[PDB]
Design an enzyme around this catalytic site. Structure first.
Site, PDB file in Angstrom:
ATOM      1  N   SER A 116      -9.969  27.605  29.638  1.00 25.50           N
ATOM      2  CA  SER A 116     -10.895  26.688  29.898  1.00 25.50           C
ATOM      3  C   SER A 116     -11.725  27.003  31.692  1.00 25.50           C
ATOM      4  O   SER A 116     -11.425  27.968  31.626  1.00 25.50           O
ATOM      5  CB  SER A 116     -10.494  25.533  30.376  1.00 25.50           C
ATOM      6  OG  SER A 116      -9.272  25.770  31.444  1.00 25.50           O
ATOM      7  N   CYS A 117     -12.920  26.771  31.583  1.00 26.84           N
ATOM      8  CA  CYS A 117     -13.948  27.549  32.797  1.00 26.84           C
ATOM      9  C   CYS A 117     -14.387  26.213  33.682  1.00 26.84           C
ATOM     10  O   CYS A 117     -14.355  25.007  33.829  1.00 26.84           O
ATOM     11  CB  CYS A 117     -15.404  27.538  31.880  1.00 26.84           C
ATOM     12  SG  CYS A 117     -15.227  28.939  30.286  1.00 26.84           S
ATOM     13  N   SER A 118     -14.448  27.187  34.614  1.00 27.08           N
ATOM     14  CA  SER A 118     -14.976  26.418  36.204  1.00 27.08           C
ATOM     15  C   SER A 118     -15.888  25.503  35.771  1.00 27.08           C
ATOM     16  O   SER A 118     -16.853  25.533  35.189  1.00 27.08           O
ATOM     17  CB  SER A 118     -15.576  26.725  36.648  1.00 27.08           C
ATOM     18  OG  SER A 118     -15.788  26.560  38.176  1.00 27.08           O
TER      19      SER A 118
END
Ligand SMILES: [Zn+2]
Ligand SMILES: [Zn+2]
Ligand SMILES: [Zn+2]
Ligand SMILES: [Zn+2]
Ligand SMILES: [Zn+2]
Ligand SMILES: [Zn+2]
Lengths: 250, 248, 242, 241, 250, 240
Positions: E165-167
Site C-alpha cells: 500500500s501507498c501513503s
C-alpha cells in the site's frame, strides 16, 4: 369523397350548429375538431371542455388545457368523481363504458348552461355511451380516417398536439381490484417520479405490497443509475417492495 | 378587459413612440414585441438588434438573427466585448448585471442615431438601479402585466410559430475569464454535443474539467470515456472528469 | 440571403415550369419540394413518383406512398429492376451510376407522358434540384418546413442495400432478403438506424455507438434470430455505425 | 487477544470433553471446528454429522461430505424432516426456532449413542467453543488459512424458508420451484442470489454491483422462470441485503 | 547461484549480528527476513517493528501487526507524526525522502535501546536508509523476486499482504498542505468506496473536488452507486465528487 | 478417500518409479506433480521439461521456466516445431492428435536419455494425480499443504482453436491472434478468445463481462486493426 368534399361537409355541419361544446383531450382528432370549430364558428361561439379526475394525471390535464389556449379557444375544466360510480370503482372490463357515460353526461349539462346545440368529440370512422348523450362525432359522420385527419391537420398548419394517447390508471390494477383514492394517488405519484427521471413510457403495476415497474427493454440499461433512489422513493409511497419487470413494457 | 386591454395598452404605447429599436434574443417575448412593433409601426420604424459576443457560441447568434430576419424586420447585429468590464472578466455574482448595462448602453447608442424614441425588450418578471431603468428602456409586456399565458395566447393569435445561457456559468465566481479558456470550454461542449449529447456542461476548474450530463445518459456515455479524456486533454485540461450528481 | 428570398426564387422557378414531376422518397428534402410544388401549382400540375425496387425495403415504399397522398398529391408508383443491370448485380464501385441512370431514365419517361416540364428531386446544398438552385441548406429546410406546417416524414435516412455487401459480391435475391429480415428485426427492437453488413457466414451489425449500451439486453435474441435467418456468426462491430 | 491464545483456548476446551459430535454444514466455521477436533481428539473420537432436509440443497450436502471425508473425519449423514412440523410448514415467524430445536434434538441423540461428551456447532462471536474462545469473523479466517484449510462453502447456504413470506404454507412444489430458480440463476454466474416467492411473482435479489452485469441475461431468465411456474419475473431494486 | 548459497549467505549474516531489529510491513520480503531471523537467532533476539502514522489506514497497521504475531515474534508498534516535518506537511516532491529519514531514525533509536546490532529492511536487488545504517540482507545475499518466493515456499510461508500500500500523500497534488482533517476525509472516502465492493480505488483530493480513480473495467458496475457516493462524499466535506474518465492512474 | 490416502497413493507410485521426467506447463497440476517428485525422489532424480512452440505464448514459456527452477528442479527446455507437420499446419479436425504425438514422442525421447522410468503430466505417459483419484478440490488442498502459492492462473489452450478448420496456420497470423489476446487480457479479461476469420476478428468474451467491456470498444478496435484485422467484432453468443 375528396379531402375537399369532407372538409366542406364538416364545415356545413358546424355552420348549422352556431354554438358547440367540444370534448378536448389534446389528441390529433379533437384538436382538428376544436380547430375547425373555431375557424368556422368563432371563438365567441365555441366552448372547449377538458376533464380532470383521479384516473388521469394532472400533467396531462394541465397540458391539454393549454394546447386549447394555444389554439385560441375559451377553455373550461371540469372535475369528475369516477369512483363515485361503483361500476368504475370495482374495476370491471366494462368500467370504461361507465366512465364515458358519466363523462358525456357532464358535457351535456355544460352544453345546456352555455347555450350549445351539441357535444363534439374527436371520434373517427375506421362507442356505446356516445349515443345516449347525443354526442356527435363530426369527423366520422363526414367519413374521415386517420389518413384524412392528418392531411387536414397539415393543411391547417397544426403541428403541436399530443402523441401520448394517455391511458386510464385503472390498467395498473388487475381486474377486480377495488380502486381507492390512496392507491391511485400511490401509482400516479410513482409514475410521475419515474417520468421526471427521463423515462416517458413507464408503467407501475400494483401488486398490493409490490410495485412492478414496466420500462421499454432498450431503456433498462439507462435506468441502472436510478435503482436506489426509485427504491426508497416508492417505498416512501407505501410499496414494501419495488421491483422491475424483466419482460419489459407490456 | 384583461387581454383585450393588455394588448390595447401595448398598441397605445407602441403608437406613442412611433419609431422603436428592439433588443431581440429570439425568445417568446422578444419575438412578440418585435412582431407587435412591425404590425403597428411598419418596418421603416422598427430596428431589431441582436448581440454577438464571445460569451455565446458562434451559432445562436446566426440563429436569433436568422429568425428575426425571417420575420421581416430590419435586423442589426452588434458585437460587445463583455471582457472589457472587470466585473464580467473576473466573473462576480453580479456579472449578469454589468453585461446588461453594457448591452443597454450599446442599444441606446444604436437608437440615438437611427432616430428611435425608445429601446424595447421582452421582459416580464441588484447592485444598484435596474439596468433597464438606468438606461431608459421600456418593457411594454411587463407594463401591461402580461403573464406568460398572455404571451402564449398572442403569438398563436398573430401567427408566430417559429421562436427559440452565458458561458460564464461554466466558471466559478472569482475565476478570471480569458479568450483562451472560453474557447477551451466551448470547444469541449461542442465536441461532446457532436457525440450525441445535446444537453451538456463542461465546468471549468483550472486543470480539471467537470462534465455534467443528464443522469439518464451517463450509461450511454461510457463508450466515449477514453476519447473524451484525450480530446479534452488536448484542449488544455489535465484531468477530465464526470460529475456523479449529473446535470443540475 | 433571407429565407423569404430563397422561397420566392423557389416559387418563381416553379411557376416558370407550370407542370412538374417530383421524385418522392419521403424524407425531409423531398417532402418540402412536393409540398412547395403543390402549394404553387395544385394537384392538377404535379405528379409524385415513388420508386419500388429490390435495393430498398417495402416498408419505405408503402410509407412514402402514404405520405404523398397525405400531402395532397396524385401519386404513381413504378418498379425498377436494378439487378437487371450487370454493374449493379456484381456490386462494382460504379453501381451508383447505373442505379442513378436507370432511376432517372424511368422518371423522365413518366414526365414526358404527363407533359411535365422537368423532373424534380430534393437534393440540397452541401433532373432539377430546385432547393439547391435556391441555396437551401439543411438548416433552411427545417425552418421552411415548420413554417408550412409539415410534420410526418421519414426521419431516418434511406440507403441502398448494396452498401451491406463488399464490392465485387454478386447480389442475389436470397442474401438481400437475408439482410432485409435482419435489419427489419433490429429496428423492431427499438433501433431505427442500423446496418447488417453481409460477410458470408458472419453478420456484422453496425450500430451508433451511443446505443450499444442500450443493446446488450437483446444480445441473445438477436443472435438466435439472425442465426435462424442463415448467418452462422452474429457479431457486433466495435467501430460502430460508419 | 492474539490468535495463538484464541487457538489454545479451544485446544484446552476440546481436550477436556475428549469425545464430541460436530454439526457439520460446510461453511468455514464448521470446517474450522471439525479439523480442530481431529487434530486434538483424533479420527476415532470425533464424529461428523450432516443434516439433509427439504430446506437445503443436495449440493451443499454432497460436497459437505466430500470435504468432511477429506479432512480425515468419521463422517455419517442423517436425514431430518421439518415441514411435517406444524409451525415450520406454515412459515410462522417462529419456524426458525422449531427448525433449530428439532435439529438439535436428534444430535443430542446421536451423540449419546456415540459416547460423546458434547455437541458442537459453528457459532462465533450444544457447545459453541468458537464463540467461547472469542473468535470473530476475522479470527476464523486467519486460523483456517493457517491450518492449511482451502475447501469450504464460501456462499452462505441459508434455509429456503427465508424465501417465503410469513403465512404462506410451503409445498414440495413451492420449494422446488424456488430452488430450481436459484440453481438456474447461479449457473449463469451469480453465486449470491435469492428468489423470493410471492405467488405469481418472482423477486430476484442480486448484489447491486452485479446488476449491471445481469442485463445480458434478462430475457432468458424471464422465459425460464416463467416455465417453472412464475407468472411475473422481477428484479428487486434494493438488491441483496 | 543456487538458492542454497544465497540462503547460506543470509544465514551467516544473521548469525553475525545475533540481535536485530526488523522493519516489518507485511510484504513477502519483510516476512522472509523476519521468518529467517526467528529461525536463526530466536524469538528473544528479534524485534519486529511496524510503523503507525496518520498517513496510512489503521487497518494495514492492524493487519501487519497480526502478521508479525502469527509468525511468532515480539512485535511492537511505534507512532510517528510525519506531519511534524515541513517537507511532508507541504507535500513537496522530495517528501518521500524526509518521510523515510524519519522512519529510519526512529528504528535506530529502538535498536539502540533494545540492544540490537543492526536494523533490517526487506529490500532486494531490483537513499535515506543508508544514511541511517540499515541493512538489507536479501540484497546483500543477491536475492531476486523469484528467489524470495522460492525460499518462502521452503519455509512454508503462505500468508502475507499481497497488496503493498501507498501513503495517502499520493492523493494530494504537490504543494498542498496536509492537515489532520483532509487526511481523514480522504481516507473515509476510500474506506467507504471499498465497502461497496471496489478494493482498488483512489480518491484524489482537489480542495472542493473529489476525483475518484477506478479500474476502467469496474466503471460500468459502478453506475448503480453514483448517487450514494455523491451524497456520502459531500457529507465528508467535498462539494463536487467526480469520476476520472482516465481511470485508475494514468 | 481422505487426502492422506491419495497423497500416500501418489508417493507410493512415485516410489516405484524411482526416476521420472515431468511435463511442466506451469499450471497448478503440473506444479503439484513437480514438487512431489522433488520431495520424494530428489533433484537429481527429476527432470522438468518445458515445451516451447509457436502454438503457445512465449509469456507462458518464460513463466514456466522460472517457476520450475523456482521449485528447485533442474529444468530442461525443448523446442517443438509443430508447423513442420502438415496436419497441424493446415489445421484439420484431427490435428490435435498429431500435436499430442509430436509432444509426447519428444518427452519420451528425453526421459529415455536421462534414465527415467516414465513421463508424467497433471491430468485429473502416467497421470498419477488421475490414478490416485485426485480432484481439483484436493489439488489446492495439498498445494497449500506444501507451501504452493505461485503458478500460472489462466490456463492457456492451444492457439489452433482460434482458426477454422482448413485455414493454414502461419507464423504471422499466429502472432496476430496471440498479440490480440495478450492485449485483451491486459485490460482485465483473463478468459477471452480472438477467432481468426481473415479480414475479421471475432472476439469471444463471457456474457457476464460484455457490459464491463463497453468502455474498451474503441481502444480494442484500433489496436486490433493495427495488427492486421480490417473489422473487429464481438460475438453476441459470448465465449463458447
Ligand atoms: Zn481581450
Ligand atoms: Zn441509453
Ligand atoms: Zn467461417
Ligand atoms: Zn461487471
Ligand atoms: Zn499529526
Ligand atoms: Zn521469452
Amino acid at each position: 369523397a375528396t379531402l375537399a368534399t369532407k372538409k366542406a361537409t364538416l364545415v356545413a355541419a358546424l355552420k348549422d350548429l352556431q354554438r358547440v361544446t367540444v370534448a378536448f383531450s389534446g389528441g390529433i382528432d379533437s384538436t382538428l375538431v376544436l380547430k375547425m370549430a373555431l375557424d368556422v364558428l368563432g371563438r365567441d361561439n365555441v366552448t372547449a371542455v377538458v376533464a380532470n379526475s383521479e384516473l388521469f394525471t394532472d400533467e396531462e390535464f394541465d397540458k391539454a388545457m393549454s394546447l386549447a389556449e394555444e389554439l385560441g379557444a375559451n377553455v373550461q375544466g371540469t372535475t369528475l368523481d369516477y369512483l363515485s360510480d361503483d361500476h368504475i370503482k370495482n374495476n370491471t372490463p366494462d368500467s370504461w363504458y361507465y366512465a364515458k357515460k358519466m363523462f358525456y353526461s357532464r358535457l351535456n349539462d355544460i352544453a345546456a348552461n352555455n347555450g350549445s346545440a351539441a357535444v363534439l368529440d374527436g371520434m373517427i370512422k375506421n362507442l356505446k355511451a356516445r349515443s345516449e348523450a347525443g354526442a356527435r362525432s363530426l369527423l366520422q359522420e363526414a367519413d374521415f380516417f386517420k389518413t384524412d385527419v392528418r392531411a387536414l391537420a397539415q393543411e391547417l398548419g397544426l403541428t403541436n398536439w399530443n402523441k401520448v394517447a394517455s391511458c386510464s390508471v385503472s390498467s395498473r390494477f388487475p381486474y377486480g381490484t377495488t380502486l381507492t383514492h390512496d392507491n391511485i394517488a400511490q401509482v400516479m405519484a410513482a409514475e410521475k417520479y419515474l417520468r421526471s427521471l427521463g423515462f416517458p413510457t413507464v408503467r407501475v403495476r400494483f401488486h398490493n405490497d409490490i410495485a412492478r415497474i414496466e420500462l421499454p427493454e432498450a431503456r433498462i440499461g439507462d435506468f441502472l443509475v436510478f435503482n436506489d433512489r426509485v427504491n426508497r422513493q416508492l417505498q416512501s409511497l407505501g410499496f414494501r417492495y419495488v421491483t422491475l419487470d424483466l419482460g419489459g413494457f407490456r
